[PDB]
């Protein structure tokens, strides 16, 4: 899944 600070 995407990292805590992604997007």
């Amino acid at each position, epitope marked *: *899944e*995407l*990292d*805590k*600070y*992604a997007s």
Partner: antibody, heavy 132, light 108 residues
Framework: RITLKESGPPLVKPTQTLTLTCSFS??????????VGWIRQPPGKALEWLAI???????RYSPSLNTRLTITKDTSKNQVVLVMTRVSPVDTATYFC????????????????????????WGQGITVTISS | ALQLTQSPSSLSASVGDRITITCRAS??????LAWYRQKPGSPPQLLIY???SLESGVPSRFSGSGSGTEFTLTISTLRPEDFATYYC?????????FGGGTRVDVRR
């Protein structure tokens, strides 16, 4: 100045449970968005990411080791513990814990996330050998 | 999962050379990539964070560029302490992968 240091048994036998402790100073696991992760390095091999835990208590694990890892924090003691169950010889490695910055804030407002993209301070590493 | 491939895996050089190590990701990782230098017997040390930002206290001969799937670390003037193994790390997707490393040794 941030410093971290790993502690635990240097030797462990197959099928046993390994508990590693990361004690740190210079930051609190209650600080905004901070993380502490664990990375291992079998002798002569590459670094391998294991897990990380943040101050808001979100936890993430390597999918390959998910079933054998538990990471937890003890905020008031400034420690992060990683428990690995059912170890086998391939788990012999040097284990490092490391700090991960949270976003920079301005008057308590997150304004920069670039600093979270790295594990910026590492502990010396603790060598663990798994053999019966 | 996501793959991070470093090139070259090994590289020979001499003091004063300019070297560049590259790291390619199987899917885009935006700018969430870090470079480290690890000397024998020591923990890895952060050189560059967020693909190109110079970490505080790190000498200016180190430079990082790129985003997406291709990144490069260049050391402009190799010093003796740079004979070591370098690693890149992706932090966009879990798990936070490391590349295989590239060993930089004394050419002869």
């Amino acid at each position: 100045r941030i410093t971290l240091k790993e502690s635990g048994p240097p030797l462990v036998k197959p099928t046993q449970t390994l508990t590693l402790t990361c004690s740190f100073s210079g930051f609190s696991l209650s600080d905004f968005g901070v993380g502490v992760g664990w990375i291992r390095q079998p002798p002569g091999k590459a670094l391998e990411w294991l897990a990380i835990i943040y101050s808001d208590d979100d936890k993430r694990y390597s999918p390959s080791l998910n079933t054998r890892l538990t990471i937890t924090k003890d905020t008031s003691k400034n420690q992060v513990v990683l428990v690995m169950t059912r170890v086998s010889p391939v788990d012999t490695a040097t284990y490092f814990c490391a700090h991960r910055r949270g976003p920079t804030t301005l008057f308590g407002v997150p304004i920069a996330r670039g600093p979270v993209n790295a594990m910026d301070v590492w502990g010396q590493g603790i060598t663990v050998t798994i053999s019966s | 999962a996501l793959q991070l491939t470093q090139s070259p895996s090994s590289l020979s050089a001499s003091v004063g050379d300019r070297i560049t190590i590259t790291c390619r990701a199987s899917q885009g990782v935006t700018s969430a990539l870090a470079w480290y230098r690890q000397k024998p017997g020591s923990p890895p040390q952060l050189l560059i964070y967020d693909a190109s930002s110079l970490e505080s206290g790190v000498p200016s001969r180190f430079s990082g560029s790129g985003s997406g799937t291709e990144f490069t670390l260049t050391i402009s003037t190799l010093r003796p302490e740079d004979f070591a193994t370098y690693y890149c790390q992706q932090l966009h997707f879990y798990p936070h992968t490391f590349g295989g490393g590239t060993r930089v040794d004394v050419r002869r």
